[PDB]
From a paper:
[name], a recently identified innate immune adaptor protein for endolysosomal TLR7/8/9 signaling, is recruited by the lysosomal proton-coupled amino-acid transporter [name], and then activates IRF5, which in turn triggers the transcription of type I interferons and cytokines. Solute carrier family 15 member 4 ([name], also known as PHT1) is one of four members of the SLC15 family, which belongs to the proton-coupled amino-acid/oligopeptide transporter (POT) family and the major facilitator superfamily (MFS). The architecture of [name] lacks a bulky soluble domain and the TM domain contains 12 TMs that mimic the canonical major facilitator superfamily (MFS) fold, with TM1 to TM6 forming the N-terminal bundle and TM7 to TM12 forming the C-terminal bundle. Here, we report three cryo-electron microscopy (cryo-EM) structures of human [name] in the apo monomeric and dimeric state and as a [name]-bound complex.
Given that the loop region between TM6 and TM7 of [name] was not visible in our structure and that a previous report showed that deleting the same loop does not affect the function the [name], we replaced a portion of this loop region of [name] (residues 253–303) with an ALFA tag in order to limit the movement of the bound ALFA_Nanobody. By coexpressing the ALFA tagged [name] and the ALFA nanobody in HEK293F cells followed by purification, we obtained the [name]/ALFA_Nanobody complex for further cryo-EM structural analyses. Unlike other conventional nanobodies that have a larger binding interface, the ALFA_Nanobody bound to the short ALFA tag in the final complex is flexible and therefore the density of the ALFA nanobody in the final structure remains obscure. Nevertheless, the signal provided by the bound ALFA_Nanobody was very helpful for the 3D alignment of the particles, allowing us to finally resolve the structure of [name] in the monomeric state with a resolution of 3.25 Å. The monomeric [name] in the apo state also adopts an outward-facing conformation, exposed to the endolysosomal lumen, and a comparison with the dimerized structure shows that there are no essential differences between the two structures. The [name] in the outward-facing state possesses a solvent cleft towards the lysosomal lumen to bind possible substrates, whereas the cytosol side was sealed by the close packing of the cytosolic ends of TMs 1, 4, 5, 10, and 11. The narrow exit route was closed by several interaction networks between N- and C-bundle helices, including SLC15A4D181-R102, SLC15A4Q485-D181-Y477, and SLC15A4Y199-S469.
Numbering used by the authors: 18 to 135, 150 to 247, 311 to 356, 361 to 520, 525 to 558
Write the structure that this text describes.
Amino acid sequence: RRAAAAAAAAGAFAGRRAACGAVLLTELLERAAFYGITSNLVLFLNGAPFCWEGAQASEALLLFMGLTYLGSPFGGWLADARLGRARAILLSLALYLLGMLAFPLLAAPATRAALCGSARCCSPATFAGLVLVGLGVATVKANITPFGADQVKDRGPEATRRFFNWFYWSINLGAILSLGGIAYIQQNVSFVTGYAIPTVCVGLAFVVFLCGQSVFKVEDVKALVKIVPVFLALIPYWTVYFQMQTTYVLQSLHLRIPEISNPHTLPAAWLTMFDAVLILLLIPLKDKLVDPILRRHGLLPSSLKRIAVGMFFVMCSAFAAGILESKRLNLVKEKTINQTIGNVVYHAADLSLWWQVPQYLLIGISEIFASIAGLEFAYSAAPKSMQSAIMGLFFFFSGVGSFVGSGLLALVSIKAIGWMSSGNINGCYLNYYFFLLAAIQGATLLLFLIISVKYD
Ligand SMILES: *[C@@H]1O[C@H](CO)[C@@H](O)[C@H](O)[C@H]1NC(C)=O
């Protein structure tokens, strides 16, 4: 009946298989370039060409990340009022490539003198490149997601749900490619070759759109004022999610990591790969085991209950992380070993890294539910005219959540609490931090359930 009809719609893509693969490939390349920049920015800035202090490099990276969130609402407005989505994304990609071209030249010893030969050694060029890259990333992110779903929007609301699955899958594949290959070359072979590859990725991503150009009011005021509270209630979700991104890697550094060979010192960025490594293996499987199974039974059809399920699994992951951290802190009092990651030696307990697998499943399932469904809700529950501007607010509130999470981490590090009073974390109670994150996620779950019920 109706179910049969919806399953038939799931039979999507169909005619438009080109128009989509082009968007998927473009997003893959863009994410590869972004993760190539973000993974080893601090090591580049604190090295031989640049004598920046660690605090200066951290502030520079923080400003670069903050720009990519602040520019999203303005990038979306530019793509709706003055230009089209295609032209806006093309201009953003051109600016992104222009900012891209700066880093290889600085890395190259011959061309460094031309740019900044004669505190911060080369602040103007680096800041201009980072500003251009941030604006390009912010404009691409706020516009690629609604542009991609535009092709599959005719076949009902079931095709835009399947597209947002292979979009996230392509994002994570690009993350794996960038953090595995490019991040390896940037630290082992050379920075020139490690930064030339993402520039080539940006160049290829620009060609794909040029090749694929041939195949691509009170009510809305009410919609705006009705969807603003839902976005506001999602700030604690991002607050917890980014803190889990950071502290999970912090814990992984202090856990027994096996060696691969007999180029040395595997990059620390590889650890982040773990999370995305799950996501790939989940997204096809899930799709199948969710597209029939959860559709013919009429289970969990809305995009907000899926966010609630994602929050539940986030809380479960926080609790598992707290348990593992308590075990690690109990074990570390007996003996400790030293292992080198990059150019720094961490003191780690003799507890295997793979014991961290149960954590990354629970958040991974969360990113199966909360991450995709958030984009689906942002796309569907938005006025037709202001599409790609509501996504701007979505990605801006994500940045607000990230910054308030950084502030929360700074809060528990004061002398009064002392949870994070000190690269060694053997003297820091990360388990209490994980339990606090779990409590925050539970309160967010309850508040979001109330908000979702009121919204519907
Ligand atoms: C760990 O590092 C400390 C400081 O260098 C050193 O004294 C200790 O012997 C190291 N332990 C091992 C097993 O290398």
